[PDB]
């Protein structure tokens, strides 16, 4: 099928440059244009520009000087590079493909790269168990989870049992603490009778710090 | 650039009702308008192209109409999985521009939260910090109050809340309240209590635990 996969999320120092790679499959770059769109708190969805089949580029007016798009057709790669990021350039960046080669109806999107512009350092999270107990059980249903504390920048991904556990999972939006580091919890409810039989593991992945932790969560 | 104004910012409906999203353009754009759905943590999903043209793999309950400056995205019978934000896009004039979006919220019956409390792990205490977590699970509507108490001392300003987006399957919310203190204060007290107030409870629900 048609797919667009973007490089991992990352931090960018103020006045420094942003580099994202979009690797496509299911179609050839020599036949379709690839566009770049972002989504910020300040200006919502914002079309940034495009590289066409033949290599020509268009850049939206505010970006003609700090934006550069290039590509390697044989490698199915499109490279985005933007210069001199200020903090209001913090946003989600997407690559996109249209339905027809010349058009702008964006039927296929990359997963989007969360880009944080900040002077701070990357910091990996600590993962602490939210242990099930009687204080976290009701009607033969137990609740349990993981506390993913003190990381920067966003995002972290959390799954349960390597993707095999999804029902009853709530992973909370990160909140910024006073220390300037984020924190979140991911919880799941399961049958209490399965606590003595099943293993529960939260798979925590924080790409910007290359931190992967599997935390086993047990009744105490 | 064309200004696209979407109205209203928030729509609130019940399953099975029809719902309509409005998009107005600053000058005529013929029928050059596309509509996108964005779900929680998702990328935009193309629903309708050129005002009214269907898109492969998009449910039949979505349709679009309009020409000129005034456009409408319709869902003929709303489902719980339609909880998202919706955006229009014009491309009659370069550069292509997007409206600011409309949020779709679903109504449902009142559902009381299930309340759970988690003491800090010994693991976390090794680091000199204690996090006590209170979880309010699958409730509606969104508004709720969490009040922390350590040994009958009402806590204030030393907790943070997070609320999930509305569930796509049952339309409920979940809330986590994290009380944060040092290892020293934590070891200095015994009773840790989270009292929860909500419309679906006939009285406040307290979950508590004695340290050790």
């Amino acid at each position: 099928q048609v797919q667009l996969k973007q490089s991992g999320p990352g931090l960018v120092q103020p006045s420094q440059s942003l580099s994202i790679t979009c690797t496509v499959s299911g179609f050839s770059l020599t036949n379709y244009g690839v566009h770049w769109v972002r989504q910020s708190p300040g200006k919502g969805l914002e079309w940034l520009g495009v590289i066409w089949s033949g290599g020509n580029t268009d850049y939206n007016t505010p970006f003609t000087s700090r934006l550069s798009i290039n590509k390697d057709n044989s490698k199915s790669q499109v490279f985005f590079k933007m210069n001199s990021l200020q903090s209001n350039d913090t946003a989600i960046y997407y690559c996109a493909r249209a339905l027809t080669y010349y058009d702008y109806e964006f039927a296929y999107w990359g997963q989007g790269t969360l880009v944080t512009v900040s002077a701070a350092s990357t910091k990996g999270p600590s993962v602490f168990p939210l242990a099930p107990s009687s204080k976290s059980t009701s009607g033969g249903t137990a609740a349990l989870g993981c506390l993913v504390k003190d990381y920067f920048p966003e995002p972290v991904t959390v799954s349960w049992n390597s993707g095999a556990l999804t029902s009853g999972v709530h992973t909370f939006p990160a909140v910024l603490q006073s220390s300037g580091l984020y924190s979140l919890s991911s919880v799941v409810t399961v049958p209490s009778s399965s606590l003595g039989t099943q293993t529960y593991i939260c798979n925590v992945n924080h790409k910007p710090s290359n931190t992967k932790v599997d935390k086993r969560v047990e009744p105490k | 650039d064309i200004l696209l104004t979407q109205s209203p910012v928030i729509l609130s409906v019940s399953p099975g009702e029809r719902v309509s999203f409005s998009c107005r353009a600053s000058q005529s754009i013929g029928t050059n308008i596309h509509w996108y759905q964005q779900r929680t943590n998702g990328s935009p999903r193309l629903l309708i192209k050129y005002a009214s043209e269907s898109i492969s793999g998009i449910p039949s309950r979505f349709s679009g109409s309009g020409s000129g400056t005034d456009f409408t995205l319709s869902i003929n019978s709303v489902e719980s999985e339609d909880i998202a934000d919706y955006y229009c896009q014009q491309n009659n004039n370069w550069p292509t521009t997007f409206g600011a979006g409309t949020k779709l919220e679903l109504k449902r019956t009142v559902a009381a939260p299930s309340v759970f409390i988690f003491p800090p792990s010994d693991e976390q205490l090794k680091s000199g910090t204690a996090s006590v977590v209170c979880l309010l699970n699958n409730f509606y509507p969104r508004e709720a109050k969490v009040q922390w108490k350590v040994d009958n001392a009402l806590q204030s300003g030393n907790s943070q809340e997070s609320v999930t987006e509305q569930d796509s399957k049952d339309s409920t919310y979940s809330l986590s309240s994290t009380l944060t203190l040092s290892k020293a204060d934590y070891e200095k007290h015994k009773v840790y209590a989270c009292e929860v107030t909500h419309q679906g409870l006939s009285s406040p629900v307290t979950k508590s635990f004695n340290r050790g």
């Binding site: 989504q39 708190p41 919502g44 969360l114 990160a174 | 943590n41 934000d85």
Partner: peptide
């Protein structure tokens, strides 16, 4: 207003 944590309007 768009929120980067949830990708939703807040």
């Amino acid at each position: 207003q768009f929120d980067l944590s949830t990708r939703r309007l807040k």
